Design a protein around this ligand. Structure first.
Ligand SMILES: [Zn+2]
Lengths: 10, 233
């Protein structure tokens, strides 16, 4: 799943 | 009875008066996320970061902060399904617990816990964290940090979460924004392993054909109505 991370677009 | 996996995000605690991540002005309580929600932010300005989570920890335990109808509905759902139910939350608040849910997986940790910066062991903690506050696990007491998962860090309980995602007959996402991964990807995993997918939210968390069933509106309205519909169904 990988690290907690933010996506900005959509 | 169906296996039901519920994922909750910030939206469900919004009506309870808890505020977080608006991916609009990019602000958390008028803080840039880089500054209060990353390992680098903590490294740069630990006193600021400790102050921020001190504030959040205090605000969480104020009388005006209460579980809302949505939280209660999820507690009733667990009551009805027993071991066929799992609740995974992105939230660091304890509102699910106060509502009556048990065995809640906090994939981003808990505001009412701190962690030893050396051993990584967690500790129950309801008050402020000061520099004078050190761990309980080491002979030489180590600094404490919030037991909250920051952007850039690995979420908690992921093995158990992905197992449940495979097993779920029904997957429900509640109050999630769709900007935060890997949680925002859970719906894909659920649908791949054959689950019926449901979104209960204010705004769409994802674009396209993933949620097979969707209802939008305030969590305190949409969640109890779906749970009721599910329970009588
Ligand atoms: Zn320690």
């Amino acid at each position: 799943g990988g690290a907690k991370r933010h996506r900005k677009i959509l | 009875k169906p296996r039901v996996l519920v994922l909750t995000g910030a939206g469900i605690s919004a009506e309870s008066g808890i505020r977080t991540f608006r991916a609009a002005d990019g602000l958390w309580e008028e803080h840039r996320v880089e500054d209060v929600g990353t390992p680098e932010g903590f490294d740069r300005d630990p006193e600021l970061v400790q102050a921020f989570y001190n504030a959040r920890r205090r605000q969480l335990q104020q009388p005006e902060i209460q579980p809302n109808a949505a939280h209660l509905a999820l507690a009733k759902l667990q009551d009805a399904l027993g071991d066929r139910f799992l609740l995974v939350t992105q939230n660091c608040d304890n509102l699910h617990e106060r509502a009556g849910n048990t065995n809640v997986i906090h994939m981003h940790g808990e505001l009412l816990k701190v962690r030893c910066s050396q051993s990584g062991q967690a500790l129950d903690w309801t008050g402020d964290v000061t520099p004078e506050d050190k761990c309980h696990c080491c002979q030489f007491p180590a600094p404490l940090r919030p037991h909250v998962v920051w952007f850039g860090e690995m979420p908690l309980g992921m093995d158990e979460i992905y197992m449940a995602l495979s097993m779920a007959d029904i997957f429900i996402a509640i109050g999630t924004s769709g900007h935060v991964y890997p949680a925002a990807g859970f719906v894909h995993e659920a649908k791949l392993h054959g689950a019926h997918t449901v979104e209960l939210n204010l705004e769409p968390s994802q674009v396209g054909n993933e949620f097979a069933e969707k209802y939008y509106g305030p969590a305190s309205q949409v969640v109890p109505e779906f749970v009721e519909k599910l329970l009588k169904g």
